[PDB]
Amino acid sequence: RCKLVLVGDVQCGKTAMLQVLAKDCYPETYVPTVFENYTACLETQRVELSLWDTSGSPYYDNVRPLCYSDSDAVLLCFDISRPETVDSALKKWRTEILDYCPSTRVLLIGCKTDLRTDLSTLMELSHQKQAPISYEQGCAIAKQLGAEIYLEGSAFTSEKSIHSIFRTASMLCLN
Amino acid sequence: RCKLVLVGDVQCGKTAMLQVLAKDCYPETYVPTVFENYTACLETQRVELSLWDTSGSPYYDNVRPLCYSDSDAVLLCFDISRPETVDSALKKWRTEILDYCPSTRVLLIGCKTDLRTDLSTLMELSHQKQAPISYEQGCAIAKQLGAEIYLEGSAFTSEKSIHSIFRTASMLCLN
Amino acid sequence: RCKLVLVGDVQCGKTAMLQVLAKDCYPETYVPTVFENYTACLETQRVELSLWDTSGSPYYDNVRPLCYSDSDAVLLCFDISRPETVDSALKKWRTEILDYCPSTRVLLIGCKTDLRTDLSTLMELSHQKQAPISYEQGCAIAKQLGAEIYLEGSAFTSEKSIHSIFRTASMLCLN
Amino acid sequence: RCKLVLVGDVQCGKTAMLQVLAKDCYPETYVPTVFENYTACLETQRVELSLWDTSGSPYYDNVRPLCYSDSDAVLLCFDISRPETVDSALKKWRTEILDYCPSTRVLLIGCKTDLRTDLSTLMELSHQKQAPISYEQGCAIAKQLGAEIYLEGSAFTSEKSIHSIFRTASMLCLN
Amino acid sequence: LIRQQIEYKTLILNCVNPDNENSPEIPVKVLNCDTITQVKEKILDAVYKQRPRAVDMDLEWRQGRIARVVLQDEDITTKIKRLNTLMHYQVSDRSVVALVPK
Amino acid sequence: LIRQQIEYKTLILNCVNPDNENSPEIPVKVLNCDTITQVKEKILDAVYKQRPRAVDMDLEWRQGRIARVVLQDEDITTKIKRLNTLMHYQVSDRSVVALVPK
Amino acid sequence: LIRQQIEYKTLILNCVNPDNENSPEIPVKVLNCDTITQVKEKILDAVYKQRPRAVDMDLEWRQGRIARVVLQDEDITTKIKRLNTLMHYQVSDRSVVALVPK
Amino acid sequence: LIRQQIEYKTLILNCVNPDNENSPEIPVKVLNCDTITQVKEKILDAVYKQRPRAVDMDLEWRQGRIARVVLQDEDITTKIKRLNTLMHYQVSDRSVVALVPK
């Protein structure tokens, strides 16, 4: 039994990951979360995961912290196609985790890796003086934060990539 | 090549059916449609279906009629757990179909048949002096309307039930 | 944590059910099982299910009994489209369960209920002086055997029907 | 309307790709094909694909050629984890294509790219004085053969990777 | 009569029937500026027309089948000392809530 | 200055770049009370700073990958004679639109 | 009596009922060394106890719902001149076949 | 030399490397008429060219990732007293097996 709480900016891909992991179902259309819980099971050692999905919105700053209680890890998520979400990770999310659960292990999770090869995303980033967050950059950001690991995937294109994130997360919590 | 347009009240289960048919994906969370198009293929004779999803809301009364053009059938949908949606079918939807595409064949489609065995739905209907629409009632309503057939299913519990609706719809349009 | 072992004649639909439950995947093509184990999780109370799939073949009469050990229930399966599999249930399977795990609760499970409306199956049964096993007949067979319950579903057409079998099975084992 | 025929060695991953594309279903267990046909639809321009799956076995050398008739492309498949299947591509499959459909465009398709990161596969290849076929190697093999393109994916881990192979295949056939 | 910059409004909460979950939820009218204690009092007045007291119960905010969080007058989210209200937590109109014995 | 009962507001439409679809959409400021002709004029002014004329083009309202409907000043949805506007069709802020040659 | 190195055996083919597909298939006993013409003759004898002739029909080997291939005495798979047999194509016992008018 | 009615044959078992599971399995030649004790002896001879003894270990027959059953000379499947063999359990050629400390 392992409790993981997912936090990170709005639309960064948290609910998409949990829906793929727990429901085998990808949400093309964005539905803003308030809070939710999923249950998944996987083998690393059978492990039952209780997965807490939270809103990335400031609107819910007062209820989201109530989800951190007794969590084995926080999954700090960001959208590799939007570097502003890495800024939030280093600032808003780091600060919130440190305010509410400072001793809890943090895993840094990149979402939407498929968008690294998406022409229109690439063109948009270029017009914004930006680029997609790379894997190497994710690892560096994890080091800077004190996150235990950087992991990434694509809920949209790789169901197994999401399974592997949570298998690895489960293994880190059991050791 | 067959063009089907789905119409019916808000939350009646239109988008859930198309997502199950075309995307193999069920939407637990309600996202209000504006309009959308799906493509599916099936064998009855290979048939390509262009499926138009429309908003059930009065809000979109001015754009939804633009979807009726050159449709081979209109699928008039209702929610078997909410008899008010049958009232709308006999009134708002009949009238709209007659105003915009009076010569187009109409198929009457019941959604959410699984809720006939759902205890909490049953209890709610009883407190409202209501009951679930039955299959026999669907057939009678189809007769009253002049719909060519009554078909029903459950997007939530039976992917094959949705496939069978559209297989039957495709066959009616080819003959 | 609940251990369920599935037994019943070859091709009766055991592996199809477990694949739908545990893997969200239906096997159209018959692959004969030797033995296998699946893990699923569901809510009734979180329950972890260890599901043992066994060969229905006499070929494996010597290894299949090794699967019965410490099981919370045996799911005795038959194919509603083939009454000979009900004969085996009352004879071979009853006798084997009584020889190897006589005190273990047995749930009687009908598979392939969708074939009750399949024209070609119906025509074949008629030419054989047979008919599909009905729900009412399943209940009667369960009574005759001393099975705790009769449950049925369709792995082919209803993923939720399989979920509901195991939810009910899990509840019977917890009470 | 586009007809594609898949050929390549036994167990190389042809049926797994078609099942993922057409059925949204991955076959963990190997079932040897004789021949089969799938229908899929996708947008590049709506395209209907008739997909012919063939046995990689010499056993069926006399029936498989009957599948080549009027095909818009042959998809010559190999298993990136087994370089012997690249040898067959350059020898048996090249020769068969040249004997039965020499003027038909050929697409070179690598299967099971996920096994490039699979520890046990890697260890096995090392003990055999082998290694996984790389993307760069696939491109080179395609050049050597006269194949129009090299494409690769993973039926096991990426449903979208298979979609993208066939989208690209459909586009090459329309131009 | 003047309206606030951040306006007060009534909300209906759908309170789970404590005797049986599958029964319809009980609608309870409350104010967004109600403290969690005042909310519990209103639910207890509506759901118990030997009554439990507000201090004997926790207010649970439910989402879907399993997810739930306990709301209270004071907790780690309080800004130092205003009592927490529904608007503090942003509880939406028609949210499903439950009263659970502490 | 008084506001309407049904208020007028500016909206941005994201117009597809006609030269290449995968390029970023072009934002065009319009009014919800703009007729479809006035909308097309504004898109043509913004997207063509030999120009096409408003009457040479259809306004397409896009949803997702494939779904699209043509909006015009007058069609089967017109109430008899007010010219159709964005608010008539309820085109939302930041909707994706395209100009397609008739 | 000696058996061949590559042995001859009887097989049953399940022939689709031509009048209605959803009716049970008709079992027809054949030999693996039967030429496709001899197979068609046997199906016509069994399925027509004005009969079609072997040369008027194609033998179709069916797999699942839609996939099918035409088998003939001579085609691109013939080795130069042995007539093609069931064993040439490796048609399995209980394979579904159909006779279709040329 | 005469062959049995039910013939004896050699089989290869793929034994899991005990030091690391992800390493290639170790092939061990055995007979289908070998008792489970004789099978364990052969695996121990091949996998340990302080050795464990046959009686110190259980033979595990593995299927896929997690499923496994223990095979022994005598158990609930024994017919009364022939020692259980590979053919008794119908262990197939190239089955994955493991030796696990009792």
Ligand SMILES: Nc1nc2c(ncn2[C@@H]2O[C@H](COP(=O)(O)OP(=O)(O)NP(=O)(O)O)[C@@H](O)[C@H]2O)c(=O)[nH]1
């Ligand atoms: N290309 C791509 N898009 C993705 C991926 N995952 C999610 N998305 C897109 O991003 C949208 C938002 O994802 P979602 O998980 O709902 O966001 P969230 O992080 O839960 N946001 P919130 O905190 O507000 O609930 C989805 O609707 C989907 O369109 C992915 O892996 N790739």
Ligand SMILES: Nc1nc2c(ncn2[C@@H]2O[C@H](COP(=O)(O)OP(=O)(O)NP(=O)(O)O)[C@@H](O)[C@H]2O)c(=O)[nH]1
């Ligand atoms: N029990 C059950 N619920 C269903 C079923 N189909 C849909 N629903 C529920 O009904 C909700 C609304 O369905 P949806 O198809 O989105 O509604 P819609 O008809 O498209 N509405 P709109 O016209 O406003 O877009 C879904 O979010 C889902 O929770 C079904 O078969 N059974």
Ligand SMILES: Nc1nc2c(ncn2[C@@H]2O[C@H](COP(=O)(O)OP(=O)(O)NP(=O)(O)O)[C@@H](O)[C@H]2O)c(=O)[nH]1
């Ligand atoms: N119509 C229909 N066919 C089904 C259903 N479930 C399984 N089948 C069919 O029955 C075949 C055999 O099913 P399967 O579960 O593999 O059989 P099994 O009971 O595990 N047999 P074994 O004991 O030999 O492993 C499947 O290949 C599939 O074609 C169902 O619900 N409906």
Ligand SMILES: Nc1nc2c(ncn2[C@@H]2O[C@H](COP(=O)(O)OP(=O)(O)NP(=O)(O)O)[C@@H](O)[C@H]2O)c(=O)[nH]1
């Ligand atoms: N790791 C991995 N394994 C795969 C993948 N695709 C298929 N496999 C494995 O390879 C096995 C054989 O695949 P399959 O497609 O059936 O083979 P085939 O090419 O059709 N062979 P045949 O020609 O004999 O019918 C599958 O049973 C599965 O276990 C993949 O993308 N990754």
Ligand SMILES: [Mg+2]
């Ligand atoms: Mg979310």
Ligand SMILES: [Mg+2]
């Ligand atoms: Mg909708």
Ligand SMILES: [Mg+2]
């Ligand atoms: Mg099986």
Ligand SMILES: [Mg+2]
């Ligand atoms: Mg195959």
